[PDB]
Amino acid sequence: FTEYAGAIKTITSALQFGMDALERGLVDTVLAVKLRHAPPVFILKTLGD
């Protein structure tokens, strides 16, 4: 039983690994869209006036 129930703890923690590394994919790809649309200060300041 302690071999079974220690093997279901491995396969959950390998699969909590899958989803909780895919919530990092949101935060990365949302930030990557923002950095593609972020021109710097020195270009955009004189266009702001």
Binding site: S13, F17, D20, A21, R24
Partner: protein
Amino acid sequence: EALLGVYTNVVEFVKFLETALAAACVNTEFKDLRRMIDGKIQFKISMPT
């Protein structure tokens, strides 16, 4: 003629739990440590992606 002398005491010092150095270490009283050969700590670090 019985002679008496003057002895000055040993200057006592603040014990180890009453100094502020023990804020940096965690103190346990292991009674029989002369029987210990080794002592180990095992970490298991799971790393996300």
